[model samples]
Target: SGNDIAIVGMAGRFPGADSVGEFWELLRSGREGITRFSDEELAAAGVPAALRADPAYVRAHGILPDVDLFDTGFFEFTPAEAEVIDPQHRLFLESCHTALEDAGYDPRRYDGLISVYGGAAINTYLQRHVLPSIDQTATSDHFRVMVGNDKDFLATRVSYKLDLRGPSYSVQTACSTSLVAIHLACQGLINGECDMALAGGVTVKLPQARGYLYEEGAILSPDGRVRTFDAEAGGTVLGNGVGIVVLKLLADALDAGDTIHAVIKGTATNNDGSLKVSYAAPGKEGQAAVVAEAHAVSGTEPESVTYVEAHGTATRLGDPVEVAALTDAFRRGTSDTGFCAIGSLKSNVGHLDAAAGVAGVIKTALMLRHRSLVPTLNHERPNPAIDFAATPFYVNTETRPWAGEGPLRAGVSSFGIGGTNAHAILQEAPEQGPTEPSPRAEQLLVLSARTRTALDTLTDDLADHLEANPGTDLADAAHTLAVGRRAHRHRRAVICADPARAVRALRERAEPDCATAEATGAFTPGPGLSGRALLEAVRTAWLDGAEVDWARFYAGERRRRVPLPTYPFEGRRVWLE
Candidate 1:
């Protein structure tokens, strides 16, 4: 994994899925999340009866649930301010925190500079909600509103709110926005722009819960399903989704014992320029060049690559063009046919535009981790235009074990609407060795939130998680809790030797006040006190809001970080009225 970047953390919210875990489930089960809205629901959403009855109207879309919900206070935003902010921005901010937590690092606690590279779809919320709700106001008010709702502020605002002190800016390239952002993030890490990075994109169609009018030869499908690479594929469907991945240099990640879900061998991005016949149409030569460059930099032979997560938009032209480009790239080094499996996430989740690239990446990484290939939904037979028998790729249409002949390797391609193409090579994570256990009989487990009810909910959630994952190491759990969490006002802590005991204590609400009043006592490490005694002293000081040297507590033990459920935001509706 030398010179490679590690995908240490991931977080996303997609159509019919609230988290990355659920998204994987939907993919694995071959479930189509692009929903068809009933006439009753469409009429209630302001669709005219005549339009609904029109034969050309496509009554379907992939909708993100609860797009109007946000916990403004959790991020320290006033309800008024939150109302004007784009929901895409709000969701991405929460996603960044989740990614960091998933990687087992808190931004405030980490010593290295963290960078943010991201993008958002067109700011439709401003036209749909903000402008309509605002009065003809002064210049100052106009500027403020623009700042809150504009796409330019997407990445910088995340950096500001998260206190990230590294390069922060938006990277927009139509449908390829996220993958382009990810490419820049990897380059940032390799060139030392930042020690770690948050990179992804978001798209949430405004005035959700509606359908659209279908046109002949358009990019959108008449039905909601996106049958990529299939003969029945008419076109793609638009979706609302957000995906963010935390990246770090492989050496740093392995040295720090960060959970490495997958390793990015290399990434390449390029624009089609004037090669394409139209501005929106893709270029085969440009796409092939980028994929070849990615494979070259990765130093992995095209023959060894077994899977490809393709940007199969399912359009009549897009599908054949993409296949041609991929075949051209793979044939450069080998002349094999149907040796690699290919699939498109759009078949299940629709095309997420700005967020599509990272969505494909996340799905592919999950496949590698699970050592299984999920079926591509709605793919019956190959698109007659694509000569699959003459190419090195085949559509993966069933869930099966993926025991490759070599190290599990895959490629992900994302082609944007304006011909900005991106390709990345990914390999399965290296085997992780076991960490040394602590000698102490009991470990301190702490939970906190902005409200008492949140604290209670978090405690129960942790209890259930630990109970479910019985093999989870208590030492790592304690370490993540102490180091990877931002301390909040309301707090609870328990000292237990095992998960069962911890669950019992938390469920019974019988924990002592580990987070005592401020300045309860200064930490005094005496020569006489050693091991458990010193650990106890540190725990007490920590509960009293005194900064404890966590590194010193586990100095001798080779403790590793583990993923815990992120903070559950208690959100109430804060949308524009």
Candidate 2:
């Protein structure tokens, strides 16, 4: 559909995985990422004796390892400035860069007005770390620290630093924050408010290796585990995570030959109004209405959706209420029982709070791309209250092939604590037809970074990637390298006609044999060079920091965007005690 939005790029860090690829692997393996901490470690983290010794305390948490690391120099932030800034903001900025690069476009080179919509969790860093350290008499320093650590400036700071010129603002809807941001992003693209948009959320409270105190009736598990949709479900655990996605109009994505992981057919959001028993409890009418409206807008029958990513919070009441709402929505079109598989990601990564929604979206998109259904971890039996045989849903318990009768389709649901419900309809991306081969016999590959060490790291990473994926198209790889990256002072280039030659050139750090002027950002190629010879001359010129005209160089040749490795940031520990 023309109104559809394509997910061109995605990047995230969850409890167990540092990248989307690793996240998928974790899901496919059906592993629980929530970890249990020892008493000794808790004491070292300054946990109070009364809290740690109590039987009500659960020493388990889902932690994002290495939360204290960042490459301040790469983002042009001083060590002192980076120390006071929220790690949530830092992680989001890095993920934004990764997402854009994954889509094969540098923000500095992109022509469209790219927008940003996102939100972060409570600013724990400000209260626990930054506030006590601020000088009492320094008003200017306080203002700077406030701007750097406040939740209000999260999205705008990303837009300002990345040079995004379209609408940029933060959205907060509790657990539904990320999905709500995604809905606004889709609206922005569909209404022509922005040509491209970045949307997602992050949640990272400090004291990473500690657990929460559990109450008898509260929503936390006593055993430090999440058992969403399981018969033994108690509740969910809290976790730290960050996720982001790059979105563009489906038509534009197809025209640009961008890699489409999946397409958002439609999305809907609404509040419970005054219908719920409590403000924090979910409302069936609101949840069902959102799903039904999403299907109506997408023009897809409920029966066509073979899977659902449920907001399975694992609470005694929450799990059943969520399933009942889903049943009500699916029953509107068909009475088919247990036809669609339903599950939750909370079983794997716990509750990411602000990041929970987009995390599910990313997981579902990965399943669509792989054409495989991953198992929902910790689901041994269905919750007793949620009658599986009576509803049109069943808990998926294993990784298996997703065979179906029509184009694969699914629904994702996210219900926040304050009754803000959001649902989205997603379908597999259309298969792209093959393209013609490059017109030229040789290709020019380039690499560059702000510093010499970064350039060396980039070269090694690319070589490793090429070696691992031997079937990569050299022509498209060369094209992505030449146009997708931001040019820098430290540079390197090579001429190669195949993946093997490219790998060899990169591994050996080979340079051009011909002579060129010193690194002065100028270019002059000698006459009588053509084909491979011409590529060699261009490579020599690029190595000398000469501004070679890549557009003119490939004027008549066909090229397509291909997936290349992203930037390799040299990270160091810049943290506050």
Candidate 3:
């Protein structure tokens, strides 16, 4: 087994359920949390005010977690901090504590404390609940203090509460936030910065909020059902929940006699800067890159995956392309393989936004435990544009049979708006396989950065990219990066035993290109140096190109000034590599 770390414990809060046990009960019933707000709620929350006339059509279905779900005494927090702070933060703080307990680790046992908590629309929360509490009256100075500051305040709160000292920060890549958190947390462990850490995400719907942004666009059915991959697929609904996982470096967990959930073979995250949607939506390029990296890190074939817990948002632009992204990334040929059945828990619970990863990971974990994939409700026909025979991943429209032996393997994808993307692969423990192993250095990243920000950006980018493109040959990776961003004159200076393998990793599939790579002087990512810094260095070199203006990179858009290849070596040449 690869010396990857293992997820030792998990905790969360979901709609109609305060704990995992209750959440599982809702899942087993195969029932969705569909409901229409009462007239009092509508008026009290000042919901659209205009929706009052449309009585019957206003029902919203989601997994709403109530305030009572938490045991307030579990964590110490000032009422001031708890009140104005996003509930999402409180949820994360509590969930992480629960997870640590689940992992049987005293928080004091690990010195490397890293918290990769996800983002929240606390801005939205403030706008809805907090701001209005201020006198909106023209004579009032009450609302001025809350008017400033970019989002990300939530991250600071958790950092202070947990006293996390290692690589701590908040991510704002929409839906991909949690996946990014998990990937970075694992990176923390691998880099020897932390041996045990807390990772995952939390998302709370702003009360009196749409719980989603796409409602006005008619993405959701009038009846409020998420018909993922269904012929009548209307759109996505919103939900509130938070998921947290405690990860102990495999050897540490085993030595400490802890229970293991799943191993962190490899995880990646990327952004869909190439995707047409500039706001908040799915990015196919980022999605594909994530899968490719995951495969590379795991050293497994894409075809070997048994199931997929997809980012099935049920959007017109989202679902159909999900099929295409998987097809293109896995190189599944022209035929779809029923070998890997796909399902969207969104059908069971409304889209959880920041908490979406939490839900997907938990669902995948449960599927591993149960050995049966749950059905996506309201699905009737597969997307006509998706050719099952060509790209053979089937949709779990109905409860299906589980055919494999031993542990079940699955992949979960989450793409966030504003360019953040994440993909995670999961495998259940073998009935009697060895568990809780160490991290292997089979994959070495020569990392460096001109600055801390450059270093951070590069590290973040590579982590995402690897998670997206699992099992992609490294030679292919180098080649892909060599030419992937052809319009940009980015040069990759990758120092690997297998350069071709690295080239293949870049070119063989789609992935996030947050930071570009280049080979300057010693082929440094930027400035600093260390043994554990190679991956970030290469990613920085690769992602550096994205920040440059193509025109500037080429000196001009025509002739002798076309962008150069990702690597100086052999590849394609719009300009000439």
| Candidate topping lDDT | 1
- The collision pairs in model 2 are none
The total of clashing pairs for model 3 equals: 90
- Backbone clashes, candidate 1: 0
Candidate 3's TM-score reads 0.66
Ranking by lDDT: 1, 2, 3
lDDT of each: 0.87, 0.85, 0.58
Collision count for each candidate, in order: 0, 0, 90
lDDT of 3: 0.58
> What does the lDDT read for residue 192 in candidate 1?
93
Model 2 CA RMSD to the hidden true structure, in angstroms? 2.2
Segments of candidate 2 deviating more than 4 angstroms: 48-50, 136-138, 512-529, 555-558
**Tens-digit lDDT track for model 1 on 1-577?**
5559999989998888889989989988889888889899898889999999999899888889887888888899989988889999998898998888887887887788999999999888888888889875798888878888888889999888888998998999989999999999999999999999999999998877888888996788877678899998898898999999999999998888878889999999998888979887879989999999999988989989999999988898889999999999999999989889999998888899999999988998899889899998887789999889999999988889998767899999998888889999999998887767778888888777888778878888999999999889999998888778887867677878888888888888753523322223345566666755665666566666666656666666777777788899888887886
**TM-score list, all predictions:** 0.96, 0.95, 0.66
